[PDB]
Structure 1
Amino acid sequence: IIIATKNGKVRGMQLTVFGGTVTAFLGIPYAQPPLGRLRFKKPQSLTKWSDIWNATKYANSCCQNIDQSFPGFHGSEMWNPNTDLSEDCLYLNVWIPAPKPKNATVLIWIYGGGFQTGTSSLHVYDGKFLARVERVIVVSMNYRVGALGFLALPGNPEAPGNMGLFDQQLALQWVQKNIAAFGGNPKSVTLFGESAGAASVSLHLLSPGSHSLFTRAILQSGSFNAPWAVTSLYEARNRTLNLAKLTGCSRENETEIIKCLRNKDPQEILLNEAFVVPYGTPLSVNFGPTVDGDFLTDMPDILLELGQFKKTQILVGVNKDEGTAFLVYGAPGFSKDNNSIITRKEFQEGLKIFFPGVSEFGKESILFHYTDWVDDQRPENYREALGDVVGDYNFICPALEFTKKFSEWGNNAFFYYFEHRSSKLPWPEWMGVMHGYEIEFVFGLPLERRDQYTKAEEILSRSIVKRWANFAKYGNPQETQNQSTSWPVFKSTEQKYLTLNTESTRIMTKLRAQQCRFWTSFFPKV
């Protein structure tokens, strides 16, 4: 099957899914490849082609450094790129139902990876199940990451910052101009993403140039006000300069520095990216979103607080054990291959790793609020507190604060707490319900009976998929038929949220109230 787009015809491929068919268009280009003089610049519009573009395989993933912390371990390597790395990577994917829909709602996935890694071609982002089961169209795109996507000398168009965010935006634009030709509804577009993808979605809610390019938004385990998600303009400059020094590209004319960095080979840039920070952490974001005066007109805490964002519905949520995955990437006494019982001294050293530039008093205050136990003899006490510290600070409390602030301006918001640990999880049990492991439920992988998930997991994915699709189509994440628990709107008064698990979906109130009053009220003062 062949589709005529505004820039030329593209050929897809038929996929067998669940005794039906999905048409997949894998690797459609949506911008001029950002090479040569175009490196670090905003994405340029694509010149029309006259042939038939063969969109039958995922395209190159963008240049990025690979996680090598556990070679051979599927738990970490499933997140690594699975196509060739290349600067020529501005491509997107489309899954459409077969038979071709008339006016399907469109879901646009933006992957995470700390703005330094990720790719749309990961197995857990395969949108063919969503298209088969709910008859939505799933779009996903690759966007530039790391220095190549977020290097910033702000106000200077040779490297203005936020390029990877403009990559995303130009793909959103592509959907507006072309998706009706695939049977999609440009007026019914929901962005969803996880971690830096969710942070990206929250910044699209804030960017005026994205407001006309989507309807609704879903934020999984991330939002821009998370402490790792926005690079200050001070650091962005100190980091651009450091990378210049590492690469032998220090000049005086700022533009001349970028010209120098433009002649460097991609691997030279990538290898020096790591050491541009003085004190890195497992959650470090070397080159990330900045206030550029283009995509972001002001500091986003200010825009959020004062109601300067797209008025629409949002679905936001977090996982029960967001923080535990990151403890094996640096915290002493931790290991995925043992139960990681750490001492009080190890917990204190762990705070130094995760809060490097924080004062002594600030680290003590973290310790004070997370080490008054129900049982002081519980030998896992400090292991779980450090996971809770990292998860509350970096994910849960920023998600809740975003949802509170956003809803205060009249919009319906829906908050979830995901507490099911995948039965096939290759990580150890002490890490519980890890960051990133709701994604496969959202994308409906457990609906495939051949893939040795439990039956209760098939049902949970089925209900989750229906709720996501109803949110995108109707602004309302209900499952209205199988006598499901009604998902109430999150209000700033009562702060109700829905728990997602295989046993009982409960409605609860005021998630992590005590912990988040420490993080969002006390801790920013330190």
Structure 2
Amino acid sequence: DIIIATKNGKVRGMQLTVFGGTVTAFLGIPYAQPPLGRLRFKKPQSLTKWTDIWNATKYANSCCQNIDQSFPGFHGSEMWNPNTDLSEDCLYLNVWIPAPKPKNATVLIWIYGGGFQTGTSSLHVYDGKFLARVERVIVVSMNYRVGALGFLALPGNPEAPGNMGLFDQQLALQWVQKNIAAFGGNPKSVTLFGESAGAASVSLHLLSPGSHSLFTRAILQSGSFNAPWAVTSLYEARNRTLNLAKLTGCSRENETEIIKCLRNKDPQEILLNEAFVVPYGTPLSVNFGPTVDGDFLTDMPDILLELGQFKKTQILVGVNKDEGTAFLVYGAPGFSKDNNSIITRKEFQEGLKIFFPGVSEFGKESILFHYTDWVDDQRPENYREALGDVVGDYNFICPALEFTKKFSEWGNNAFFYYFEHRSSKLPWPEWMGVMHGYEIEFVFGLPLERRDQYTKAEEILSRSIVKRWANFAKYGNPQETQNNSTSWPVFKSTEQKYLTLNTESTRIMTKLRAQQCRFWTSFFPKV
């Protein structure tokens, strides 16, 4: 029986057997007042004592959100869907700890992706018990509001100010500051880590003065706040808030009256209209995301980044070899997960239309010009490969590299990875390669479980990544120092060295996608 006293009450956890040892898991601790009724669309409110032993013995509700129904029955997509009840009452967090209780353990705090519209901490690929067992760190993860319920904005209006879900993440870091010593944690050694929209969220906590003192270091997997999908403009945000009002018949003249109307709507009506607050959309659409609210985010974040206005600390930033492929089967003509998807030039051009809505005709042509100068015109998989590269370079790889670069220019050590291993167990087709999302299970250590059908080379790759991630958290340096591993150099502007992660031999390379990112980064933002 393990009871820990928190500032708010006692919590009971549960014991788990992991690799012939024991981990204590406290799943589903509340960290804020449920954001129901009058609290819907407001910032999270702090929680008050219970007294009372809260049983933290199962995952809590995931936050309200639309689900992916493109491939029913398919594990590839469905493994990403929520696996606990959806509810507005979703402001909970999990803590895994080594057994025996550690003395002053480094803490890893996971923030999930999901386009800011979906996601939950209770996915099996986010389970923190292998890390706690193997590296003796504390792993913490939290649910935070997504979609309109998390990011609806009527700028400056405390009834609906924007960024509520970022504030939920933030109030969870506060909970770790106040409470993690009780569990054997070190509040002075906390590393935030996240993937996709979770990584962009980590990058914005680097920018937020309210977050500065709530953590030590940061890890960004496939995402940064300068990615083109990560920040909504004040103009867009309003248009979308009002379009939601119109679609739910909540149009008004008094903006606070609009919000009052939206709080009477049932969670489901709001969810069902979210998708149309926008005329055109893409498979990377973030209808309701971060905005500049003058609170969480004080200025346009590109300005903050450029001018050195962020937390000074080390970062670890990486991307996967084939970020863009997963998205091609959510609407690009000629694509399918059930065949090899050899598309034509005309289909490629149509695909650009899906992913670059408007986007001038000249813009789309320039993308076509940069990516289709074949060497050579023979290769039938040409146009199919070019479209995924277009998508992953624009949306993930080039913003990550540009982020790392601008961050490093202010003096801090930074380390960049390029993840090139495709899981032996991937249920997606071979042509999709090293997909977005599929480093996560390696970082969380799932392949350490032999019972599980990953190869030997995969167990070894994972064990090594886990060590580097843990050494980063504890010591600011992602080395694996014992097994003659390749040493991981800092990423500097000028050299831009990065480390490749794969089962065969890991290399030090330079200037990833140099020629492609010159296009996305200097030229395209003009069109």
TM-score when scaled to structure 1? 1.00
Q: Which residue of 2 aligns with 1:456?
A: 457
Deviation at 1:241, TM superposition (A): 0.4
Q: Which residue of 2 aligns with 1:425?
A: 426
Q: Give a deviation string over 1:272-322, Cα, whole Å, max 9, x none.
A: 000111110000000000000000000000000000000000000000000
Deviation at 1:354, TM superposition (A): 0.3
Q: Give a deviation string over 1:116-168, Cα, whole Å, max 9, x none.
A: 00000000000000000000000000000000000000100000000000000
CA distance in 1, matches of 2:381, 2:204: 38
Q: Which residue of 1 aligns with 2:189?
A: 188
Q: Give a deviation string over 1:212-232, Cα, whole Å, max 9, x none.
A: 000000000000000001011
Deviation at 1:192, TM superposition (A): 0.1
Q: Which residue of 1 aligns with 2:70?
A: 69
CA distance in 1, matches of 2:288, 2:364: 26
Q: Give a deviation string over 1:423-463, Cα, whole Å, max 9, x none.
A: 00000000000000000000000000011000000000000
Deviation at 1:47, TM superposition (A): 1.1
Is 2:225 aligned against 1:220? no
CA distance in 1, matches of 2:255, 2:24: 47
Deviation at 1:50, TM superposition (A): 1.0
Deviation at 1:508, TM superposition (A): 0.1
CA distance in 2, matches of 1:133, 1:127: 10
Deviation at 1:374, TM superposition (A): 1.1
CA distance in 2, matches of 1:211, 1:130: 25
Q: Give a deviation string over 1:250-278, Cα, whole Å, max 9, x none.
A: 00000000000000000000000001111
CA distance in 2, matches of 1:521, 1:193: 27
Q: Which residue of 2 aligns with 1:399?
A: 400
Q: Secondary structure at the match of 1:108?
A: strand
Deviation at 1:357, TM superposition (A): 1.4
Q: Give a deviation string over 1:402-431, Cα, whole Å, max 9, x none.
A: 000000000000000000000000000000
Deviation at 1:509, TM superposition (A): 0.0
Q: Secondary structure at the match of 1:85?
A: coil
CA distance in 2, matches of 1:157, 1:343: 51
Q: Secondary structure at the match of 1:86?
A: coil
CA distance in 2, matches of 1:125, 1:447: 14
Q: Give a deviation string over 1:26-68, Cα, whole Å, max 9, x none.
A: 0000000000000000000001111000000000000000000
CA distance in 2, matches of 1:381, 1:43: 49
Q: Secondary structure at the match of 1:208?
A: coil
Q: Which residue of 2 aligns with 1:116?
A: 117
CA distance in 1, matches of 2:458, 2:94: 27
Q: Secondary structure at the match of 2:65?
A: coil
Q: Which residue of 2 aligns with 1:381?
A: 382
Deviation at 1:205, TM superposition (A): 0.1
CA distance in 1, matches of 2:447, 2:347: 38
Q: Secondary structure at the match of 2:210?
A: helix
Deviation at 1:207, TM superposition (A): 0.2
* Unaligned stretches of 5+ residues in structure 1: none
Deviation at 1:177, TM superposition (A): 0.1
Q: Secondary structure at the match of 1:290?
A: coil
**Displaced runs of 4 or more, over 2 A:** none
Q: Secondary structure at the match of 2:276?
A: helix
CA distance in 2, matches of 1:97, 1:154: 43
Q: Give a deviation string over 1:372-402, Cα, whole Å, max 9, x none.
A: 1111110000000000000000000000000
CA distance in 2, matches of 1:164, 1:330: 29
Q: Which residue of 2 aligns with 1:296?
A: 297
Q: Percent identity?
A: 100
Q: Secondary structure at the match of 1:275?
A: coil
Moved more, 370-379 or 54-63: 370-379
CA distance in 2, matches of 1:74, 1:101: 36
CA distance in 1, matches of 2:473, 2:251: 48
CA distance in 2, matches of 1:500, 1:279: 37
CA distance in 2, matches of 1:373, 1:513: 18
Q: Secondary structure at the match of 1:62?
A: coil
Q: Which residue of 1 aligns with 2:151?
A: 150
The CA RMSD measured in Å over matched residues stands at: 0.3
Q: Secondary structure at the match of 1:489?
A: coil
Q: Secondary structure at the match of 2:33?
A: coil
Deviation at 1:337, TM superposition (A): 0.3
Matches within 5 A, 1:42-191: 42-191=43-192
TM-score when scaled to structure 2? 1.00
Q: Give a deviation string over 1:7-44, Cα, whole Å, max 9, x none.
A: 00000000000000000000000000000000000000
* Unaligned stretches of 5+ residues in structure 2: none
Q: Give a deviation string over 1:96-125, Cα, whole Å, max 9, x none.
A: 000000000000000000000000000000
CA distance in 1, matches of 2:304, 2:337: 40
Q: Secondary structure at the match of 1:109?
A: strand
CA distance in 1, matches of 2:370, 2:306: 27
Q: Give a deviation string over 1:350-387, Cα, whole Å, max 9, x none.
A: 00110001000000000000001111110000000000
Q: Secondary structure at the match of 1:235?
A: helix
CA distance in 2, matches of 1:374, 1:475: 42
